[PDB]
Design a protein around this ligand. Structure first.
Ligand code: NA
Ligand code: NA
Ligand code: ZN
Ligand code: ZN
Length: 322
C-alpha cells in the first residue's frame, strides 16, 4: 500500500576546532556501520573564513580539516549538511560571536543587554541588507568547502525581532519580519544556488497551542513569529526538535498538514528518544516524514558519538524502514 523506503537516519554534531573535527572523522566509519546515513554539522561562525576575513579566527575549524570531513562522508555515503544560524544564537552566555563582535551595528538590539544579561542570546537585524550580504557569502563559502548542495540556516534561538531598540524593525509585524528573512535566504540558497534548505521549526510553532506548542521547559519569550509558517516555501525542510517523553508530539502533524517535509530530532534519554521515534513511525507511510535526527546531549568533543546509547538502542527501528 506504499512503496518501501529508506529513512533519513541522521546525527547532529558540532565542530568548532580542528581537534573536534578530527574526533568526528575518527567516529564516521562506526556511525555509518550503526546505520547513520546523514550528518548535520553545526559550524556556526567557527570556520576560518576567507569571504569576510573579519570573521576569521585562527583557533576554529580549518579548510584542511573541513575538506577531510567532507571526503570521509563522501567515502561512507553519509549525506553532509552544514549548519549556520543565519539570524538567532549570535551569542552564548557573556560571549558574543564573530559576526556581532565585528559588526555591532548589525545587532537587532544594539546598545542593550550588556554581556547578554536578561536574554538567552542575541539576534541579527532581519531588515539590514549587510546581514544578508555577509551571510550569503558564508553560505557560499561553507558549502564549497564541504563540496555540498545543502544548507541548514538554523533560525532557532531568535528571541529578539522587531524590537523597539531597532530603528529598521521597530513596530513592524514579527511574522512578516521572520518570513522575510526565511524568504531572502531561500531566494539565495534555493532559487539561485540550487541547494536544498533546512531550518529549525521553533519560530513556526504557536507556543500557546496545547497540541503543537508547550515544548520548552519555560513559558518565557514572545510567540509572534508563528504565522510565518504560512508565508514561506513548503520545500524548506523543517527539523523539529523535541526533548520530552510523550505519547503524541503535535508539532509533527502540524508541519506535515501545512505541507512541509519534517525531520523529527531527539536529544537526551533512551525512553524519550524511543518515544519520539515510535510516534514518528505512526507516520511512516507519509513520505514527508523523512526519518529521525539524533543529538548527543552532553557531548562537546565528538568522541564516542557512535556509542551514544539512545541511538545504539533505537536505530534498528529506523533501519527497518517503512
Ligand atoms: Na560549532
Ligand atoms: Na570539499
Ligand atoms: Zn542561543
Ligand atoms: Zn532590526
Amino acid at each position: 500500500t506504499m512503496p518501501k523506503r529508506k529513512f533519513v537516519i541522521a546525527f547532529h554534531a558540532s565542530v568548532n576546532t580542528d581537534k573536534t573535527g578530527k574526533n568526528l572523522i575518527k567516529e564516521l566509519p562506526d556511525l555509518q556501520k550503526r546505520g547513520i546515513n546523514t550528518l548535520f554539522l553545526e559550524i556556526g561562525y567557527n570556520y576560518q573564513w576567507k569571504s569576510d576575513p573579519k570573521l576569521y579566527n585562527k583557533y576554529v575549524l580549518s579548510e584542511t580539516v573541513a575538506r577531510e570531513i567532507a571526503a570521509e562522508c563522501r567515502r561512507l555515503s553519509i549525506d553532509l549538511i552544514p549548519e549556520i544560524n543565519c539570524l538567532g544564537h549570535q551569542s552564548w552566555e557573556n560571549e558574543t560571536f564573530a559576526l556581532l563582535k565585528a559588526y555591532p551595528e548589525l545587532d537587532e538590539t544594539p546598545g542593550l543587554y550588556p554581556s547578554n544579561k536578561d536574554i538567552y542570546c542575541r539576534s541579527l537585524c532581519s531588515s539590514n541588507e549587510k546581514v544578508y550580504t555577509i551571510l550569503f557569502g558564508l553560505i557560499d563559502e561553507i558549502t564549497e568547502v564541504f563540496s555540498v548542495k545543502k544548507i541548514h540556516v538554523g533560525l532557532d534561538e531568535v528571541f529578539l525581532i522587531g524590537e523597539d531598540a531597532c530603528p529598521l524593525c521597530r513596530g513592524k509585524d514579527k511574522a512578516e519580519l521572520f518570513a522575510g528573512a526565511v524568504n531572502r535566504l531561500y531566494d539565495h540558497c534555493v532559487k539561485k544556488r540550487g541547494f536544498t534548505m533546512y531550518m529549525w521549526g521553533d519560530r513556526l510553532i504557536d507556543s500557546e497551542d496545547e497540541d503543537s506548542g508547550y515544548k520548552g521547559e519555560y513559558e518565557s519569550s514572545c510567540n509572534g513569529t508563528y504565522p510565518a509558517v504560512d508565508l514561506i516555501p513548503k520545500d524548506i525542510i523543517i527539523c523539529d526538535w523535541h526533548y520530552d517523553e510523550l505519547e503524541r508530539y503535535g508539532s509533527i502533524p502540524y508541519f506535515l498538514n501545512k505541507g512541509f517535509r519534517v525531520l523529527p530530532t531527539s536529544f537526551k534519554g533512551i525512553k524519550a528518544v524511543n518515544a519520539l521515534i515510535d510516534y514518528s513511525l505512526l507516520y511512516k507511510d507519509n513520505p514527508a516524514m523523512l526519518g529521525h535526527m539524533y543529538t548527543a546531549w552532553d557531548n562537546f568533543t565528538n568522541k564516542n558519538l557512535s556509542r551514544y546509547k539512545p541511538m545504539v538502542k533505537t536505530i534498528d527501528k529506523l533501519k527497518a524502514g517503512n
